[PDB]
Design an enzyme around this catalytic site. Structure first.
Site, short mmCIF file in Angstrom:
data_model
loop_
_atom_site.label_atom_id
_atom_site.label_comp_id
_atom_site.label_asym_id
_atom_site.label_seq_id
_atom_site.Cartn_x
_atom_site.Cartn_y
_atom_site.Cartn_z
N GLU A 1 -12.79 4.81 0.26
CA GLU A 1 -12.89 5.31 1.69
C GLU A 1 -12.96 7.05 1.43
O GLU A 1 -12.84 7.74 2.55
CB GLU A 1 -11.52 5.15 2.43
CG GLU A 1 -10.41 5.20 1.53
CD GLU A 1 -8.80 5.12 2.19
OE1 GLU A 1 -7.77 5.30 1.91
OE2 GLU A 1 -9.09 4.43 3.45
N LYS B 1 -1.34 -2.16 19.78
CA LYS B 1 -2.47 -2.65 20.55
C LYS B 1 -2.76 -1.46 21.93
O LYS B 1 -2.14 -1.33 22.61
CB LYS B 1 -2.25 -4.04 21.27
CG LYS B 1 -2.18 -5.26 20.36
CD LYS B 1 -2.15 -6.58 20.99
CE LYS B 1 -1.54 -7.45 19.92
NZ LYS B 1 -1.83 -8.75 20.66
N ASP C 1 -5.44 1.82 12.54
CA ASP C 1 -4.18 2.74 11.92
C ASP C 1 -4.61 4.25 12.20
O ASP C 1 -5.62 4.65 12.77
CB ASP C 1 -4.12 2.34 10.30
CG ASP C 1 -5.38 2.70 9.39
OD1 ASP C 1 -6.28 3.29 10.01
OD2 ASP C 1 -5.26 2.26 8.38
N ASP D 1 -11.50 6.04 7.78
CA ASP D 1 -11.37 7.35 6.92
C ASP D 1 -12.65 7.74 6.39
O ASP D 1 -13.03 8.92 6.32
CB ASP D 1 -10.33 6.76 5.82
CG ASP D 1 -8.99 7.36 5.85
OD1 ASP D 1 -8.62 8.12 6.53
OD2 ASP D 1 -7.97 6.53 5.60
N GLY E 1 -14.09 0.41 4.57
CA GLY E 1 -13.70 0.48 6.07
C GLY E 1 -14.49 1.73 6.62
O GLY E 1 -15.06 2.46 6.00
N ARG F 1 0.84 -1.30 -0.08
CA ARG F 1 -0.05 0.03 -0.01
C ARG F 1 0.89 1.20 -0.07
O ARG F 1 1.41 1.52 0.95
CB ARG F 1 -1.09 -0.03 1.17
CG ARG F 1 -1.79 1.28 1.30
CD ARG F 1 -3.19 1.23 2.14
NE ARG F 1 -2.79 1.11 3.65
CZ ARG F 1 -3.72 1.37 4.55
NH1 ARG F 1 -5.02 1.61 4.23
NH2 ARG F 1 -3.49 1.57 5.95
O1 LIG Z 1 -8.53 -0.06 9.39
C1 LIG Z 1 -7.90 -0.28 10.56
O2 LIG Z 1 -8.75 -0.08 11.56
C2 LIG Z 1 -6.59 -0.78 10.35
C3 LIG Z 1 -5.69 -0.79 9.23
C4 LIG Z 1 -4.44 -1.44 9.80
C5 LIG Z 1 -3.22 -1.85 9.45
C6 LIG Z 1 -2.47 -2.11 10.40
S1 LIG Z 1 -3.53 -2.23 11.82
C7 LIG Z 1 -4.78 -1.69 11.08
N1 LIG Z 1 -6.12 -1.08 11.55
MG LIG Z 2 -7.77 4.53 5.51
#
Ligand SMILES: O=C(O)c1cc2ccsc2[nH]1
Ligand SMILES: [Mg+2]
Ligand SMILES: [Mg+2]
Length: 706
Positions: free
Chosen positions: A413, A600, A612, A441, A438, A324
């Site tokens: 997104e 975490k 993220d 975003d 997702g 990515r």
């Molecule tokens: O969309 C999310 O919450 C998300 C993406 C990524 C990539 C590594 S941990 C993580 N969480």
């Molecule tokens: Mg995103």
């Protein structure tokens, strides 16, 4: 100064050395010819990149005024058409992307995502193509601790038996015997090409013997049995001499699942990379993964098997890799022009990650069909998608690659991509291998785009709003209508609660039931558990069943998540402000002080979440929204930040080198960044957090450079 001049470019020395000494060799590409290629691609495409970014600002400014000068849905929609936000829907088509690996075109299953800046995590990911069901069940809350089955420093046999039982039950549901259960099996044999199973009183085979895919060791007494269901592999490891195998009625040591069919190595939201040294670390890891020599403990090799009818075959033992890149917004000082202006980061990622990925096609290996897989985040609409493709075209020329080698994964997104999704896909019709959705975003953009309309519903509420449910369905419909089923992935979002695996197993099944070819998991363990869902759900059948349906209208997509007047009590408001301030602070402190983009993070209720950077966008945009419309004050925001800061501090007490934010708040760069993200939030382009984040990280590093 400390840069190499090539044309109008001043390349950072670490970068220049890294390309020439590490990246380029092996690629048959002439170093100086490459750099000249970079110089020209940058100069040629930069103004086009800028024009798209400016266009975003124009649209948003028009939308801002429109709201302030008022909810007539028909007029609102007609306005978005007039300003070129909502563009006409193109006639039906079918994507033509060719040279795509089977793991993308055909196989439905989990897809891991991991911060490229973390060599060990990235290693585990590439090796998570296969993972142990027993380890996953025993290690997580899927098997309840409850009565004698709790985990200890010692192996607990009461627990292992539940693990075994769960696995036997899974085998019953996945590869059913013509008669009787796997739970009663006593042995496995291969007579005349057909897998025979030893029952106490009789013997049977698979109700459909087609699911028999092979074995290891001798047909009479095999060391394992390979099964296939819904294109996914299942391996029963038979070893009566093992600890678990000894007490097992059939000698079974373990059940291995094909788990992470694909993995995305991430240069974007799960990584903190604000300068030239950071990008090189990431590029270097990406290099090692592609040459197949990264280690800390190596990359797994293919797997050997024996055909049901005697012969020999093989299956891939690694997770097919995507990368990515970052989106269109940010620049990076890894290259500057003569005027000192930073070069566009996305343009750099295309050249460098694409250059590097050449190693993945030669032996160690990745794409057996000859493709490079780039996931592109944060695009706003179809012109931005066509730009990405044109960029790819050019980079392919610099690299001497056949055209369309560099495939695109279009992440849905941004709202202007959502409501023009069919056109976005068509702009990439010969390169597209992936779409997905997702929460973070997309909701951040949702809030920003309608910032002026009024106060928004709370963050939790968002997950069930009409716009987002319409957007989830719309994504699937568009991909299928464009012919994704059998050609390209249709993905859905991340499970963020890393310790809550029972819940994941319970709820995440909805994603393949919704027709998702793939969806995101935060760990190899999670990938293994999530694989269960594709065994229970026949995604191809589901996708076939959804075809032709239009389950979301433009009106539903455009339904702004505005709060109905006086929705909340003052304690609900505080609960939400606190919650969001905690999210910012918890993620910001690790990001600014340690350059950690994914970990975490205990939320306000001490639940571990793995989000993220986008968690920052949604939370900051929501508070900025609430600020703008007077739901809360500036006194409110600061008070909450001061309350949550020591709480975050305490949640990091288990960190060998953490630094408190409290009580000296204004001397904390992390605290100031969280505060700035919120107070400056409404003025950030589309609510993007990176401008503020990158700067504050660069500030911390300069402060530390003393
Ligand atoms: O969309 C999310 O919450 C998300 C993406 C990524 C990539 C590594 S941990 C993580 N969480
Ligand atoms: Mg995103
Ligand atoms: Mg089936």
């Amino acid at each position: 100064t400390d840069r190499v001049s090539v044309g109008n470019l001043r390349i950072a020395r670490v970068l220049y050395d890294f390309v020439n000494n590490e990246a380029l060799p092996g690629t048959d590409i002439d170093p100086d010819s490459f750099w000249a290629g970079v110089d020209k691609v940058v100069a040629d495409l930069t103004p086009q990149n800028q024009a798209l970014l400016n266009a975003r600002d124009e649209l948003q400014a028009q939308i801002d005024k429109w709201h302030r000068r008022r909810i007539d849905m028909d007029a609102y929609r007609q306005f978005l058409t007039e300003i070129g936000y909502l563009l006409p829907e193109p006639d039906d088509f079918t994507i033509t992307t060719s040279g795509v690996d089977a793991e993308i075109t055909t196989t439905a299953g989990p897809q891991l995502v991991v911060p490229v800046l973390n060599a060990r995590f990235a290693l585990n990911a590439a090796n998570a193509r296969w993972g142990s069901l027993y380890d996953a069940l025993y290690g997580t809350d899927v098997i309840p601790e409850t009565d004698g089955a709790e985990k200890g420093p010692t192996y607990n046999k009461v627990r292992g038996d539940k693990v075994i039982a769960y696995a036997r039950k899974f085998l019953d549901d996945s590869v059913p015997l013509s008669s009787g259960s796997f739970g009663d099996a006593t042995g496995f044999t291969v007579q005349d090409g057909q897998l025979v199973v030893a029952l106490p009183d009789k013997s049977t085979g698979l109700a459909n013997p087609g699911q028999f895919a092979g074995y290891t060791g001798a047909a009479e007494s095999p060391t394992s049995v390979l099964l296939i269901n819904h294109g996914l592999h299942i391996e029963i490891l038979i070893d009566p001499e093992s600890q678990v195998g000894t007490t097992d009625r059939a000698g079974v040591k373990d059940v291995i699942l094909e788990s992470a069919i694909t993995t995305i190595m991430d240069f974007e939201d799960s990584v903190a990379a604000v300068d030239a040294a950071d990008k090189v670390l990431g590029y270097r890891n990406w290099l090692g993964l592609n040459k197949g020599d990264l280690a800390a403990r190596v990359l797994n090799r293919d797997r050997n098997y024996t055909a049901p009818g005697g012969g020999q075959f093989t299956l891939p033992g690694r997770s097919l890799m995507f990368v990515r890149n970052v989106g269109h917004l940010m620049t990076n000082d890894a290259i500057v022009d003569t005027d000192g202006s930073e070069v566009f980061e996305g343009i750099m990622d295309a050249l460098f990650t694409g250059l590097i990925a050449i190693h993945g096609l030669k032996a160690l290996i990745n794409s057996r069909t000859g493709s490079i897989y780039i996931v592109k985040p944060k695009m706003h609409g179809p012109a931005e998608v066509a730009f990405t493709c044109e960029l790819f075209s050019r980079v392919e020329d610099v690299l001497g690659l056949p055209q369309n080698t560099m495939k695109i994964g279009i992440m849905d997104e941004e709202r202007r991509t959502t409501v023009n999704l069919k056109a976005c896909i068509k702009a990439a019709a010969d390169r597209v291998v992936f779409i997905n959705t997702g929460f973070l975003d997309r909701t951040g953009d949702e809030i920003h785009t309608s910032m002026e309309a009024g106060p928004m519903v709370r963050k939790g509420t968002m997950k069930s709003q009409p716009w987002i449910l319409a957007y989830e369905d719309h994504n699937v419909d568009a991909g299928l209508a464009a012919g994704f089923s059998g050609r390209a992935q249709v993905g859905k979002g991340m499970w963020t609660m890393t310790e809550l695996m029972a819940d994941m197993v319970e709820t995440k099944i909805a994603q393949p039931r919704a027709g998702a070819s793939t969806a995101w998991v935060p760990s190899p363990t999670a990938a293994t558990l999530h694989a269960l869902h594709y065994h229970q759900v026949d995604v191809a059948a589901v996708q076939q069943g959804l075809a032709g349906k239009r389950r979301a209208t433009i009106e539903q997509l455009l339904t702004i998540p505005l709060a109905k007047e006086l929705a909340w009590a003052p304690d609900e408001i505080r609960e939400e402000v606190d919650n969001n301030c905690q999210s910012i602070l918890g993620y910001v402190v690790r990001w600014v002080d340690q350059g950690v983009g994914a970990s975490k993070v205990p939320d306000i209720h001490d639940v571990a979440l793995m989000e993220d950077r986008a968690t920052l966008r949604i939370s900051s945009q929501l508070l900025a929204n609430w600020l703008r419309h007077g739901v809360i004050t500036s006194a409110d925001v600061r008070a909450s930040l001061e309350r949550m800061a020591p709480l975050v501090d305490r949640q990091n007490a288990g960190d060998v080198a953490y630094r408190p934010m409290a009580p000296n708040f204004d001397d904390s760069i992390a605290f100031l960044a969280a505060q700035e993200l919120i107070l400056s939030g409404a003025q950030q382009p589309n609510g993007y957090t990176e401008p503020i984040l990158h700067r504050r990280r660069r500030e911390f590093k300069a402060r530390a450079a003393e």
